[PDB]
Write a protein that binds this DNA or RNA. Sequence first.
DNA 1: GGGCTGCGGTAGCGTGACGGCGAATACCC
DNA 2: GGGTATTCGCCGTGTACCTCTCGCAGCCC
RNA 3: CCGAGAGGUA
Lengths: 151, 251, 66, 101, 1319, 85
Amino acid sequence: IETPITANFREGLNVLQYFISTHGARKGLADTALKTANSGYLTRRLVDVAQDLVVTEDDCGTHEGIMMTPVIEGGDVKEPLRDRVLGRVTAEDVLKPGTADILVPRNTLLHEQWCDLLEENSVDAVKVRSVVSCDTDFGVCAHCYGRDLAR
Amino acid sequence: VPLDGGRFATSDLNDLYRRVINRNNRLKRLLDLAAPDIIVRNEKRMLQEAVDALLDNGRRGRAITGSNKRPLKSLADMIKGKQGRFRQNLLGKRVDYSGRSVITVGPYLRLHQCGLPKKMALELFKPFIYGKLELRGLATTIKAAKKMVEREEAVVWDILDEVIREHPVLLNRAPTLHRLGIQAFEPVLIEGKAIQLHPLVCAAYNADFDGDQMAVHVPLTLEAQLEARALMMSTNNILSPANGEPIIVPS
Amino acid sequence: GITKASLATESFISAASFQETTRVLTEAAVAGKRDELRGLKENVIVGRLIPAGTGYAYHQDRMRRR
Amino acid sequence: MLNTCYRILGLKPTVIFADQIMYTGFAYAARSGASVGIDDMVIPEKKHEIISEAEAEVAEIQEQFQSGLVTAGERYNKVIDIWAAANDRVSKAMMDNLQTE
Amino acid sequence: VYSYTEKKRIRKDFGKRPQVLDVPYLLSIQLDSFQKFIEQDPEGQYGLEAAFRSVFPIQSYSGNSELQYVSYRLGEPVFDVQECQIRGVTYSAPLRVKLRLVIYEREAPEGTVKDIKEQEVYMGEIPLMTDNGTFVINGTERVIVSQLHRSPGVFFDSDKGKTHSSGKVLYNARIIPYRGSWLDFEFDPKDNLFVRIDRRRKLPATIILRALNYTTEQILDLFFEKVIFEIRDNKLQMELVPERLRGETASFDIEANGKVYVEKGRRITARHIRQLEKDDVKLIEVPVEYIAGKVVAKDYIDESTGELICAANMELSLDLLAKLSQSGHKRIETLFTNDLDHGPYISETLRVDPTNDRLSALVEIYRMMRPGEPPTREAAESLFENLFFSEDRYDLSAVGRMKFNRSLLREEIEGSGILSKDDIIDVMKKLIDIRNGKGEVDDIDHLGNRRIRSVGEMAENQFRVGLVRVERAVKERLSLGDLDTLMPQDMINAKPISAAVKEFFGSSQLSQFMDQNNPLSEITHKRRISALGPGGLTRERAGFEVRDVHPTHYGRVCPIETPEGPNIGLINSLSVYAQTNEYGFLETPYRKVTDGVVTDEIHYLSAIEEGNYVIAQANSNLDEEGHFVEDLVTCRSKGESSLFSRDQVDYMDVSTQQVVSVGASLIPFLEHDDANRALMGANMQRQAVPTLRADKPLVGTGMERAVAVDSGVTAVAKRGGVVQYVDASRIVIKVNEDEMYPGEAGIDIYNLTKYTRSNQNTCINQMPCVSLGEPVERGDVLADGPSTDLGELALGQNMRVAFMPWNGYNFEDSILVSERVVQEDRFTTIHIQELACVSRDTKLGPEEITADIPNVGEAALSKLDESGIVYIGAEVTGGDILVGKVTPKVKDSSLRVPNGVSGTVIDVQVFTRDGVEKDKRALEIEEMQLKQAKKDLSEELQILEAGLFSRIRAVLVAGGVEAEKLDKLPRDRWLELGLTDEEKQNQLEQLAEQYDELKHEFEKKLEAKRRKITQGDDLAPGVLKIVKVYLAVKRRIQPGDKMAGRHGNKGVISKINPIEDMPYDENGTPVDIVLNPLGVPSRMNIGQILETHLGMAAKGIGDKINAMLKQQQEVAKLREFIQRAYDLGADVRQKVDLSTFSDEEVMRLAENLRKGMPIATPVFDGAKEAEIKELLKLGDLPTSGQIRLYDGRTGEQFERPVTVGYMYMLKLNHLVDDKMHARSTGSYSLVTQQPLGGKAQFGGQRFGEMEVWALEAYGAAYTLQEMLTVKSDDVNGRTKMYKNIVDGNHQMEPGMPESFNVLLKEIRSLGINIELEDE
Amino acid sequence: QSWYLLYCKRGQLQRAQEHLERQAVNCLAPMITSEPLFPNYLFVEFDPEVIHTTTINATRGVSHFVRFGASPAIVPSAVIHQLSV
DNA sequence: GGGCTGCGGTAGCGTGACGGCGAATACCC
DNA sequence: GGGTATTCGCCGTGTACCTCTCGCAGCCC
RNA sequence: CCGAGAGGUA
Ligand SMILES: [Mg+2]
Ligand SMILES: [Zn+2]
């Protein structure tokens, strides 16, 4: 609306300004009271597609895993690598960015101390083990999941 | 079963089965009498539609109805839907040893314990109190113990503080979305009628204090007391499982 | 997709506690399907220990002793 | 603070330290007496002149609209742009007037 | 000047804008609607007369008898409203209808009937409305809520995007009748026009034109204009009006008059159209490629050979032109099918049409409508001629014809109810015009397109259903009628009308149970506009836009009072000033503005009129003449709030309350709150319980008076005069002579309603607020109802509130309360519970109501009397015995007090079927009620006789006066003294006729009341006697209740502190209630702070008056300070005329002000901040509103001074000892062996689905296993577990749930073989 | 005029036959010996141009036609002949 | 008094959700 | 004969709790 | 102690 609400709440809103405000707030209450049904039905569909998947091994014995890079849309670097590769077990051993060094080994959990030694060396991207690459029949092995997240 | 009065509130399946049997008796009598072709075709067709209405009502053209225009509920409608047997009686059940009341703050608590009223505590822990009353020797039978806690004499409150002590309870806010919405506390007895809930824990439950209500559940067996203390205790849930961020952040 | 994937499961109680029960029970009936339970909601239906949590040792024991 | 306590000292000092945080926060918030009044919401003194400069700008745009120099969509875009700019200036006026008063 | 309860406590009224129109009577929707339904209104509209003039005179199918109508009537109700609520009957009236049967001979359309008969027959009973807008349907008090539905008449809807998945818009057009069949027209993405009737199958729409006896040529005459090709010298030239070339490409050489106008290639511009009109260009010679795509208009036949050349609507080729050119048809009419404007939609629909004549059109329509049964000429013609064209089964009402003529831009507004040919053709033409571009669609949320149904309209429609069923019955009986041996009740039957009207008033989606806990809540459930109901939308489907506020809601529907949750914006509440239009639309007042001077005349508008005019704003500064003091003013033109000039406006808003409703205009400082918190504040303000001691909001809006009067909970005086007697039971008012009738000497006796049950178990109670011998005026209040204080509206109470964190006890939204709140009983509300005990008739013998009970002792019968029922006044607790009832097997089935409740038995009612004999307490209560009724009718006769004799003394002052001889013989013979032959002897005869009428009426009403008590009551078939016991719990306040202010600040009262630990200021007074400041920056409801400061100033004036009156001063200093308090500041409306209060009404006012000076802060024109500061300077309080407070625990000052003031806090009826519940082992369900649900059933908590997922999320496998097997369902598991617990062995023996075996039997009861395999 | 079947309401065959006798519609129902040999079935004879099937369906005591599909069932004249027992 | 039963009528009542997906089928080769 | 492509018709649409009324008439057998 | 309708709390 081209004419704003120039009055705050310490000054009084007059009638038209409060009515435009009620447009803006009735839309929000209708959105929450109808949004909650889709949110609950989404949780239901998700826990019934999951429903089965239990950590059932300790190592699937693979060398494949997705390539965690920091994500960049075109502005400044949005989510750093330490947010994405915190507590996820590497797939192959990460080379130190200088030349051919075994900086971290190939099956180490990357907790905060390892991630700080990753941030000091300015590591490009980590090939890390992902759940979708797990070779375990009927479940997910304990390394391809990652850290416990609340433990 | 009859409701309060003198008439029987009959189920819908009795209407369906009674219709199928009425039509089947009519069809047997017409095949006895050797009625012509069009009569027994309509009779068998009405039996076909009656059976098809009994099994899954309304999958055929417009569903039959008894009272008044609402269709009556068939067997497949006892299975399917939000109110069938899966989603209403097998995945979610109603539960004994459970309670419900309005929450309030009580900031003196340590974060492994919650306040729980004396009236709810004496109702949820009736069998444990019965065991203690026949074990110390203050009640011979079970009728004597039930009269003692029906009267609420001066000696059952010490029994109650001796059944509470190291026995966790599951507090639960009614829209539980993630696993931090069921947490196990130790009770501290409250003169009052409102569950006193430690404030930091509120940011896990999405519980403000504008009229909210919570349910308490009692772990009966011994493995369940140990699961409430070792997995579901409120000291054990200090990080949200969705990420690494602490969920006992001061609000 | 997630509802087509949870209704296409090798366990018809898992695909019947969820959406449409008519389609899934007729498909399982005319296929003569069998539900080796082996998941969380089959054991929440049938009333026993979950094969995930504390009950994973119990299901290790039962799967070992066959 | 609680996160670094959990990463260094583990679980039991973090539980007892979460409780001591909550107790000392409640106690000194009680000792603080941190009310809210009608005088606490400080109106910017520059707010009325900002609104009058925006009113002069919409007056210029509508005087161009009576003489047909500009299009209607460009008029609507110019009005939403100057009210967004005046809104940001009013917010900066009150935010200086609150953050370092 | 003021009335006499206005001079008691006159509220300091801020507010600058002078109000011009006072608030209308807030229950006028319900009352005007139902007064329209029942009223003897000749000329027939609207009412019951419309129903009888539609259904009557009934004539059968040439049966030579025609029952006609004369007049109807409603007799007295046999039960007045109080004893009707007590006994359980409907509050109805018998509907006495005169019916006149005349019976013909053979061959008498014009012949005189052979015999007549006429009687006042009895059909149904209709439920009358109580004077407050309520019904009493079966003992309970219910309210019909006004519906908001789509108007009858055409609507042009678009559905622009979602269909076709291609961005191509459609355009449908629905002709919605008030009663009958729905007709919709709609495009399809092939650009063809389709009709459908009642949402059935899709027919191509021109078949309905072919059903109206239109040939193809007439249809093409209607929807297309002709282009004339003349056969001429060469190449068959063309008449060309230059309008048709607008915006197209010149395909050929455009030349005439020896001059080349436009060549090939360039598009034809409007300058070229001006060239062709200036050059007068009509006839031009075309190439043969121009006609090779056009379509013929009418038919042509070869004349000599005698056969057809081409049918109408046929495209043309060159050989077709060689056919028609050689025959001799010189004129060729073609259809101008402009791709830009004039599209060929009708023509392509005619190409889709599989029909050719009228008869096949009707056969195809009949095969659409009623499928399968063999279409015939008579059957299909009767179907289609009674679809829309008969007065019986299709009827656009007056509203429908007005909307139908208005949306088609017709001139008239009144017409016939059925459609016609021209109406369907006009709807198709306007739909085609909307597709072409001209004209636009309608929106459905626009409140000019949205009618209101109310009580009279809905009951009239149900009554018309009952009357058409009884006329089908009368047509049944009359053709089987033998004469003269029947009189008109073997024909007519009172059963279907009564059945239908009780079906609506009992079981409908709008006749619903009244929210009755509050005067606000009654008066705002009666003013409710629901979108739901029959014929309207549903809660769980729609939508987004119908849940949203549209710019036509300004002054018709409250924008902010709508319930949050599943139905937001469907349950809208009506505004303060909004009446209802004659047609049912919502018209709101505006002030007519002829020129610069804003005139004080008002004028009502609806939303289809508000768009055309320019309507100002309520608060725009105008000074002393009505001239707008600016040269530009904010107005709104067509739903768009914009700034206009000083002299363009035609209307102004009447008053600045008019946008909002009576729930959310009681909130002071509304304009400072957020919209969300005003919504939550109004919705909670409906929910307040009436406290035991009503307490006058210090910061009100002045609308408390109108709500407390207009909701009928207070005993407003009917005729003014002098109080003769005041008791808590009755109030006897002597009437002043000017308002007093000549006969019926007359003094008004108001019976007050003492402690009784509301619909929400609260206590409705009236208390007299006038003393003895005190003048009252007409319209003044006499008895304060629930939640009222001297005629104002006191929902909650005003308490001293500090804003600070206090040791965590008010953490999220909690509220920390002193002990001075709970010691004073200043929230201790009174609840009343009705409990029934029924003696049903069962096999082996009925159930006694005896005192002797098996397996009790003295502790049961010590509370029960000689008859077994509890005494009145006996304090009972849970587990007590109230009514002793036994069942011969003998088992105890006595009424017992529910678990957890206490109380005092306030009343015991006993109802007995006529024939079952009476236990002795029934005769005791019967003789008590009998003596009470005899006593009260004697009090009526004696006190009215005292007033009559006082009038006789007032008339016998003159005219042969005998003073001492008056009281020698007693008061009966004062007529037989000396008096002349004048009108005073006439008046003595009048009062003698009054007294003799009173003698006869007293005797007959006494004997009839003896009969109405002593007879047995109508009970359910199977129950013998019903004893109802009324407990009254008194609930105080406790940790866990819910309190709230008026602004949306909810709270669960957490700690009930002692007095000492409270934060006391330096004067010494503790603060009562501590709230939390952190709610205020987030929840942007800043109005509670200005209410806090202004209430602080109000009690500052009250403390100052309490000092000036306690430390007692002569009244000069009090009237000077009261005058300073009532002047105070800017230009206001109140000032006062205080020096005319007789030196005593100053003192009675100052006695009623010593608890705080009440301040009216109106809704959007409220008190500014400088006036709050200036009023805080009149009292001796600090200007900032903030006082330094010490701590009661440590005795030392809180740093940074805190806010203390008086907020009006309410106690909502969500009390904690109605929510607390626990279950160890109770009763179990029957089909699935799981616990029951609820609290009234002693049941356990539903451990639902997401809690099971939360236990699966942990490792809780054993907790979940006992949570769904042992604690819930498995019967062997739970009995073994209970024995294992009480032995001291916490161990579960699980087994299989029972409801899973129920699942196995329900699945197995299909043709499904589900099993359980190997060990 | 071709023969149709009508299923009447339960226990209203007398009233249905009475109203269809006041109309010009032939009724046919065997009486066994006195209750009808068949249940609520009844055989009517009319012509859908003379009296329409909707008017027959809206008669007091007639529940519905034996339809089997869209159109009501024509029973052949050999059946109506062979109910002359 | 009763079994039973889907409306009550010499028809028509219905009429304000929206999307997704898969089979059934129509139109055009 | 089968390839698009429209139409039809079945699926689904949050959790927990609290209160209230009301739950067969017709009926000709 | 099962269903429907209306309303409300979070
Ligand atoms: Mg809340
Ligand atoms: Zn793996």
